[PDB]
Design a protein around this ligand. Sequence first.
Ligand code: NI
Ligand code: NI
Ligand code: NI
Lengths: 112, 112, 112
Amino acid sequence: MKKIEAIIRPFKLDEVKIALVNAGIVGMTVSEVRGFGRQKGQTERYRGAEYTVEFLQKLKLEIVVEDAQVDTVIDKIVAAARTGEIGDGKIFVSPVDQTIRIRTGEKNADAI
Amino acid sequence: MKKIEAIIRPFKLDEVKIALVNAGIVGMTVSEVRGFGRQKGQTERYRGAEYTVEFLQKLKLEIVVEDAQVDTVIDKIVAAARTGEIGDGKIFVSPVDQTIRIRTGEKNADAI
Amino acid sequence: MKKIEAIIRPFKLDEVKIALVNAGIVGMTVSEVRGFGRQKGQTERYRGAEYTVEFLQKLKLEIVVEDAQVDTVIDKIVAAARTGEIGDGKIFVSPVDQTIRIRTGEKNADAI
Ligand code: NI
Ligand code: NI
Ligand code: NI
């Protein structure tokens, strides 16, 4: 298995969430986090001519999927979370060796 | 080392927490997360004949242990977090290459 | 890439945060968590002669960096988060196989 983590803009939550559920992906978990981001400053020159780096609210999405589904999940998240502006966030993929379903004790494990 | 992550029902927190501490496991960290879960609907047919999938509160438990202790910790969590009903949650095991104790600088690392 | 996670005392947040940003490290994310810690008890014998283990607030810092930067980031965190007293926290290093920048779709991946 693989772990997919994504840091996104808070207002994009429902879009990403619904897009995944509609694609048949429902095992995501979301947590509130803080990170650095840009904030436009006042100017007459042009958009973004000046700005500051502030500590602000973001959301962390976590999903554990089979190795074969990784690319598909990434494509969905990228498509739904993108705005085209700086600060859209990043996706990190890491390994998960095994999963255990608490209710039944069922196990799913990677082989050496 | 290995990282053990578990997504459990909020009301099971104290049971799981105390069970682990009493077994000599005290390095757990807990965070609030949201995820999808079922919610029984009204009916006269039978329990669960109808229901909805909602975005609700859950808890994420994280513990880093030696490879040898993994199975033991999993057994404790499963035993304490289980209710037998759908939505009990899952446990994910992943790798941790090294740990550093901030106070002393002491290190513990895996070998290639 | 590698994932660096650190569990620190809440009041050390700004010190660690500023130290990292000033060193050119700005991709950190922070989340609130709870974990066990000591609490000094009343006594006339000596500092720490008695105490209790309580469930209290801590902060989890997460940063994904290139393998080459790991030691540098760890040194900064240790230096800034240390108080010298028990309960300073720990740092865990784990693998990250790939990163995807949501805005552009740009990818960075490890080789087999
Ligand atoms: Ni895996
Ligand atoms: Ni390990
Ligand atoms: Ni890597």
